[PDB]
Coordinates of C-alpha atoms and ligand atoms in Angstrom, one line a residue:
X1 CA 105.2 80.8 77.4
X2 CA 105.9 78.0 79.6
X3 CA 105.4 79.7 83.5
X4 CA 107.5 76.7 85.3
X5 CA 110.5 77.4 82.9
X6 CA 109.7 81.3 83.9
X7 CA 110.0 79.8 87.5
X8 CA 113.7 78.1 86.8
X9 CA 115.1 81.0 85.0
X10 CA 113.8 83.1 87.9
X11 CA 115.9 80.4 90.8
X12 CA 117.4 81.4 93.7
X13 CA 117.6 85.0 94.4
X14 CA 118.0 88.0 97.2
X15 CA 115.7 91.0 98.4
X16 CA 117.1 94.5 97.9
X17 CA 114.6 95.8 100.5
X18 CA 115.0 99.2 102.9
X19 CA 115.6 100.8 99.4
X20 CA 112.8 101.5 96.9
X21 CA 109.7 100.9 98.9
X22 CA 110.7 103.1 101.8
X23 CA 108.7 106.8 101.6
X24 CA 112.0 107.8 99.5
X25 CA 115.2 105.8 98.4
X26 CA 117.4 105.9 101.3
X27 CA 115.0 107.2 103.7
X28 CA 115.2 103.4 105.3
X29 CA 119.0 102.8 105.3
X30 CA 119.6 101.3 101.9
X31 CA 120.2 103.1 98.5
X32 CA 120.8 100.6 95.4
X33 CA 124.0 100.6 94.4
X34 CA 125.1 99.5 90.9
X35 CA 127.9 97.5 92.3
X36 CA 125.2 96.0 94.2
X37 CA 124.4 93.9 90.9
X38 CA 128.2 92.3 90.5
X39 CA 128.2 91.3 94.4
X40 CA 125.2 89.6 93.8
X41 CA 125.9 88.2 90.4
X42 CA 129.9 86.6 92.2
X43 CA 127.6 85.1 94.9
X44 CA 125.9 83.0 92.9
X45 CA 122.1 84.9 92.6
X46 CA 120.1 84.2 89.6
X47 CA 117.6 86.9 90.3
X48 CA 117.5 90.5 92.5
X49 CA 113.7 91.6 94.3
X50 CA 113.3 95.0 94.5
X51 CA 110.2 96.2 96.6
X52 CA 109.3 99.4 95.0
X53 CA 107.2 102.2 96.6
X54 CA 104.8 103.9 93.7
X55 CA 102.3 104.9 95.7
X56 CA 104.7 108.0 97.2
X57 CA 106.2 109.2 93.7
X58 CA 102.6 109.5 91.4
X59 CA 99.8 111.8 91.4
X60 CA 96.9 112.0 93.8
X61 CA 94.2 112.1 91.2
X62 CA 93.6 111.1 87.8
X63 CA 95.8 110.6 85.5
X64 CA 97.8 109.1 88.3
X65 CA 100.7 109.9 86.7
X66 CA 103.9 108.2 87.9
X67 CA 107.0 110.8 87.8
X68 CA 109.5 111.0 85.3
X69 CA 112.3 111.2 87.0
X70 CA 111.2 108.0 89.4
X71 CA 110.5 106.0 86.6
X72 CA 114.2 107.1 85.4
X73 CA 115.6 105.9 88.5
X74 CA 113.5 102.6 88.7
X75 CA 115.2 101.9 84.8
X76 CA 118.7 102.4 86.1
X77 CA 117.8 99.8 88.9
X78 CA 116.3 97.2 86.7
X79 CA 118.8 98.0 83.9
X80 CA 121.7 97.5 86.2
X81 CA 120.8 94.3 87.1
X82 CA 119.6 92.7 83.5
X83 CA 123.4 93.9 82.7
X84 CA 124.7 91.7 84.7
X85 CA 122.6 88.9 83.4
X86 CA 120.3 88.7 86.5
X87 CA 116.6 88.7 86.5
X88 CA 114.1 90.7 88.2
X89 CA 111.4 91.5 89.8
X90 CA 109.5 94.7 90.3
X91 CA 106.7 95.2 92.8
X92 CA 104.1 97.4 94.4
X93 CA 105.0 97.2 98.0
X94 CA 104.1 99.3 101.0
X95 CA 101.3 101.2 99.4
X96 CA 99.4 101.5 102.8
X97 CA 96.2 102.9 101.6
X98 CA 95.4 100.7 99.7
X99 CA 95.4 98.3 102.1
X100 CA 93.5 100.4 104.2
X101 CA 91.4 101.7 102.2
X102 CA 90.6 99.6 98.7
X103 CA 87.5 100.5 97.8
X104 CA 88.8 104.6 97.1
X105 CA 92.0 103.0 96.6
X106 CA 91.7 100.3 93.5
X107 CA 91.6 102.8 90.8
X108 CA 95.1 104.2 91.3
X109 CA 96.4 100.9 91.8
X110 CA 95.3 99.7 88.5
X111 CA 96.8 103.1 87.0
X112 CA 99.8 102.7 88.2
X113 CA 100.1 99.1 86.5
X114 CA 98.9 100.4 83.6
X115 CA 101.8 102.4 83.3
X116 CA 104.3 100.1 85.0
X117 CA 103.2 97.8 82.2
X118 CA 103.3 100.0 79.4
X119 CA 106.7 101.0 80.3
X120 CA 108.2 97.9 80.3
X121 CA 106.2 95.5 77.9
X122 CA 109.7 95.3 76.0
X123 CA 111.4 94.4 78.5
X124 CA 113.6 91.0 78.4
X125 CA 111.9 88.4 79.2
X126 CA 113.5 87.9 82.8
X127 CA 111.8 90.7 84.2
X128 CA 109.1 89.7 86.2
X129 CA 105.6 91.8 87.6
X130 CA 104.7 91.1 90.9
X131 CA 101.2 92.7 91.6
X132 CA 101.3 93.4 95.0
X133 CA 103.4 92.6 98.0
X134 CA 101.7 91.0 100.8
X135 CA 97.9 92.3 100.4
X136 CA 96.4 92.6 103.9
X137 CA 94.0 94.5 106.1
X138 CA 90.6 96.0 104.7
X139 CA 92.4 94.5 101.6
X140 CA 90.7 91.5 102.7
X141 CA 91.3 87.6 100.8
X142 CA 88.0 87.9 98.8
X143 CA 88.8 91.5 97.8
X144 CA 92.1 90.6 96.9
X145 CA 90.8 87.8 94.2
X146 CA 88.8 90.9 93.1
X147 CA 91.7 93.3 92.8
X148 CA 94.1 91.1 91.4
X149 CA 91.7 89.9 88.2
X150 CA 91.2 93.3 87.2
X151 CA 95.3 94.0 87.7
X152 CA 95.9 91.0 85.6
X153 CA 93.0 92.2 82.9
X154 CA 94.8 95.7 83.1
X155 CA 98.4 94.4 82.3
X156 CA 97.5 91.6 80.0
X157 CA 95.9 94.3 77.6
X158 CA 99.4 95.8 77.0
X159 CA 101.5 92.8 78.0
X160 CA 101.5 89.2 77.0
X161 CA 105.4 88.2 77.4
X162 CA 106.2 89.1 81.3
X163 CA 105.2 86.3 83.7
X164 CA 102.9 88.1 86.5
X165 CA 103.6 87.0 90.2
X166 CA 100.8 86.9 92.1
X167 CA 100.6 86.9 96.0
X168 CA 98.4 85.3 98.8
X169 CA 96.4 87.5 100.9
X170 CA 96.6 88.0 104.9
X171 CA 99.7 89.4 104.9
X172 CA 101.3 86.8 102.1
X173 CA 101.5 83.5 104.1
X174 CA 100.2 80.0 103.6
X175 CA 97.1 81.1 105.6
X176 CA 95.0 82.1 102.4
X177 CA 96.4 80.0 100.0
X178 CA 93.4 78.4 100.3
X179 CA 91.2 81.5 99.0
X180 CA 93.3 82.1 96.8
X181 CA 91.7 82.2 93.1
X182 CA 94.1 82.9 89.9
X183 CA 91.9 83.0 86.3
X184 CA 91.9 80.2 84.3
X185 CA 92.7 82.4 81.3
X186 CA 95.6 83.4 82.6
X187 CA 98.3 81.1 81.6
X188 CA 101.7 82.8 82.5
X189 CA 101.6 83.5 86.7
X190 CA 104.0 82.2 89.3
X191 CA 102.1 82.6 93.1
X192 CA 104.3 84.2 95.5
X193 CA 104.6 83.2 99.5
X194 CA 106.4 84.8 102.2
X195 CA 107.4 82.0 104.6
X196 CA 108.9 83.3 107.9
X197 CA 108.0 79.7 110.1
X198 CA 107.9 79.7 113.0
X199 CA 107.3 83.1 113.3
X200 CA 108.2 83.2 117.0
X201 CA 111.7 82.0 116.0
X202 CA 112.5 84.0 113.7
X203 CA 111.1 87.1 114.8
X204 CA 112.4 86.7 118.5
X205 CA 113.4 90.3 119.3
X206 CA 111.7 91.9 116.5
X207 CA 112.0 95.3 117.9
X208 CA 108.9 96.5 115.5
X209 CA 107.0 93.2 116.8
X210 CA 105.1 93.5 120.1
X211 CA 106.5 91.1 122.9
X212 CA 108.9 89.4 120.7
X213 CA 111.3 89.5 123.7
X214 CA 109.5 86.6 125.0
X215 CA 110.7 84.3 122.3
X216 CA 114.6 85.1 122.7
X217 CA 116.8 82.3 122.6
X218 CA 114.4 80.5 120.7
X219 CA 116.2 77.7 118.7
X220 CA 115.4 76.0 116.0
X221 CA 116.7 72.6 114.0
X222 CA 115.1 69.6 116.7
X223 CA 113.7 67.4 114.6
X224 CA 109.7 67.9 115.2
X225 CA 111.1 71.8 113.4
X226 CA 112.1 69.9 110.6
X227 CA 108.3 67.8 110.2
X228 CA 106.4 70.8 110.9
X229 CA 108.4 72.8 108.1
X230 CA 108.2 70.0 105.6
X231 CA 104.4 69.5 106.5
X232 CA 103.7 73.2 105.9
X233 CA 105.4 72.8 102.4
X234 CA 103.7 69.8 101.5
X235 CA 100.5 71.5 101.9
X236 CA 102.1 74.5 99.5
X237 CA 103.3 72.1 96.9
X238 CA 100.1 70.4 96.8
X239 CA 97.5 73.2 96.2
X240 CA 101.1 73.9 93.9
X241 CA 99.6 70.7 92.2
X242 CA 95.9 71.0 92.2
X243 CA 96.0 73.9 90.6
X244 CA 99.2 74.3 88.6
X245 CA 100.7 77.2 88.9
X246 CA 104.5 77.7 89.9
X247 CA 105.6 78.3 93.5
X248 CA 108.2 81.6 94.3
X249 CA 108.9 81.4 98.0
X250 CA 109.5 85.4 97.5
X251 CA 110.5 86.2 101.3
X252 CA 112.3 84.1 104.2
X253 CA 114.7 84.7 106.8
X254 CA 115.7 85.0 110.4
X255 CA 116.4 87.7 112.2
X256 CA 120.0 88.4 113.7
X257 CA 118.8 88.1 116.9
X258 CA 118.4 84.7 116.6
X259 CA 121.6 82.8 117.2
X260 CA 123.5 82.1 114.4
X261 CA 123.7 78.8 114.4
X262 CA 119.9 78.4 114.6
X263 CA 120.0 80.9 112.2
X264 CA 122.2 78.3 110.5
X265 CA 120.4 75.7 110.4
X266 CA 116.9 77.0 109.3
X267 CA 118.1 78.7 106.5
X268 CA 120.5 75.8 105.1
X269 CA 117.1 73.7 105.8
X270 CA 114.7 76.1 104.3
X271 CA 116.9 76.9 101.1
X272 CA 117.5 72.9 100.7
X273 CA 113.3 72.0 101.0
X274 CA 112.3 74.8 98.3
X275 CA 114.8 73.2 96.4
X276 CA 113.7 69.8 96.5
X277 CA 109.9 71.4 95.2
X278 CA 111.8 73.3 92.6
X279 CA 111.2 76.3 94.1
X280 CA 112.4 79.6 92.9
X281 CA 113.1 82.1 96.0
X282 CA 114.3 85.2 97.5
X283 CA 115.8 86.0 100.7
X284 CA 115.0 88.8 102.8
X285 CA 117.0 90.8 102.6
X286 CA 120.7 91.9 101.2
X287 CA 122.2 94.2 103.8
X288 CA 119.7 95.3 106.2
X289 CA 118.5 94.3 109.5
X290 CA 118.0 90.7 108.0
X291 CA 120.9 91.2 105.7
X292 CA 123.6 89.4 105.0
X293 CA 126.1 91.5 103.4
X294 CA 127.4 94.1 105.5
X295 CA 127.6 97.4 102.7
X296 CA 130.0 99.4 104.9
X297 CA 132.4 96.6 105.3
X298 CA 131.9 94.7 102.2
X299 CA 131.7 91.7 103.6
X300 CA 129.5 88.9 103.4
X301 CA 127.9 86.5 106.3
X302 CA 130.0 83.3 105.1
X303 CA 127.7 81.0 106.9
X304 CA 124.5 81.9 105.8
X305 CA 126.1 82.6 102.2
X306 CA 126.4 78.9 102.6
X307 CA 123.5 78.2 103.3
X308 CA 121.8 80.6 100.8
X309 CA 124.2 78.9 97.7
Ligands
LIG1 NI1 109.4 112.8 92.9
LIG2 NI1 81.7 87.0 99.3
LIG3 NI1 108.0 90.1 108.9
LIG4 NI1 104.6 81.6 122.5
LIG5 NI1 131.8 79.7 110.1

């Protein structure tokens, strides 16, 4: 298997986020609606991300055993999409003690992709396993190279067909790219970033980010933006190089509280520089604080669909 054509089938694609990886679906303001999957598939999408939660539907101790009736629902949700010709990827996202605490930690994880990729080794071929959203904390860079070996060992001995995404560690930015160390032997990976640049822009007014107040009215498309951002993915696209594996931009946006144009212009610039580098991507998110498809109203944000496809 050829992980760059992987890359292409996976393309341009959308976050469902708020959903899946909150404690419970719906607990953070987004359930996953199978109509989701034909709004997505109209706009253009090649691909749905859906952050999933394990870690708060599987048991404490060994066996580790996810639950039936979680694994159901995670089927329907990767089922409803693959019907609509959409690929996908799955994650492990929010599970916060591992972060926290890996060394107690890393055996669970590992059973719970055991599991994961037992359940879906027969999967098409457009479903994709992404190890671990945006490792950080005690989960430190070197750590992370250990972890995500023995992940990749744990799937590969049930699964040889899925391409594994693999993320960077320090919260999943270009800032350890650098450490980051994929096997040799392990052919079929596409490395995952989450490029939110410059963070003070498009974070201005984070409510859950301290003193992001400061950066209001931030703006964003003068022409030193537009080095700087092309300068930051020339570095990506050359360790992309060096080391040849595939590049999956797997987060980016703005937040609303950034002014739309602004908002305009860094996403139309963003989208149209990962697609020069043949970069497959996902934005963050579909409908919530980030989104840009209002659920209640059925409506989508025409400018930034523009600038998305
Ligand atoms: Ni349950
Ligand atoms: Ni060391
Ligand atoms: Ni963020
Ligand atoms: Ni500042
Ligand atoms: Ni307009």
């Amino acid at each position: 298997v050829d992980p760059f054509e992987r890359n292409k089938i996976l393309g341009r694609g959308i976050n469902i986020g708020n959903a899946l990886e909150a404690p419970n679906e719906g607990d953070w303001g987004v359930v996953i609606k199978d109509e989701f999957f034909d709004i997505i598939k109209e706009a253009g999408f090649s691909h749905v991300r859906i952050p999933i939660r394990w870690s708060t539907h599987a048991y404490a101790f060994p066996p580790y055993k996810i639950m039936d009736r979680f694994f159901k629902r995670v089927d329907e949700v990767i089922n409803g999409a693959l019907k609509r010709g959409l690929a996908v990827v799955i994650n492990i996202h929010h599970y916060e003690e591992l972060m926290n605490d890996p060394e107690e930690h890393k055996e669970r994880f590992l059973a719970l992709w055991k599991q994961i990729a037992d359940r879906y080794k027969d999967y098409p071929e457009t479903l994709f396993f992404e190890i671990l959203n945006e490792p950080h904390g005690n989960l430190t860079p070197e750590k992370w190279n250990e972890l995500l070996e023995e992940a990749l060992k744990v799937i590969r001995s049930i699964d040889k067909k899925h391409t594994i995404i693999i993320g960077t560690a320090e919260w999943g930015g270009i800032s350890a790219l650098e450490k980051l160390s994929v096997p040799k032997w392990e052919k079929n990976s596409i490395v995952t970033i989450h490029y939110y640049n410059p963070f003070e822009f498009t974070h201005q007014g984070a409510e859950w980010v301290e003193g992001s107040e400061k950066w209001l009215g931030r703006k964003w498309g003068s022409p030193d933006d537009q080095k700087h951002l092309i300068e930051e993915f020339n570095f990506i696209e050359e360790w992309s190089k060096k080391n040849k594996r595939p590049i999956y931009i797997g987060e980016f946006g703005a937040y609303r509280k950034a002014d739309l144009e602004s908002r305009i212009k860094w996403t139309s610039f963003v989208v149209r520089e990962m697609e020069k580098r043949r970069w497959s991507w996902a934005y963050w998110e579909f409908c919530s604080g980030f989104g840009v498809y209002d659920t209640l109203r059925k409506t989508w944000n025409k400018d930034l669909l523009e600038a998305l496809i």
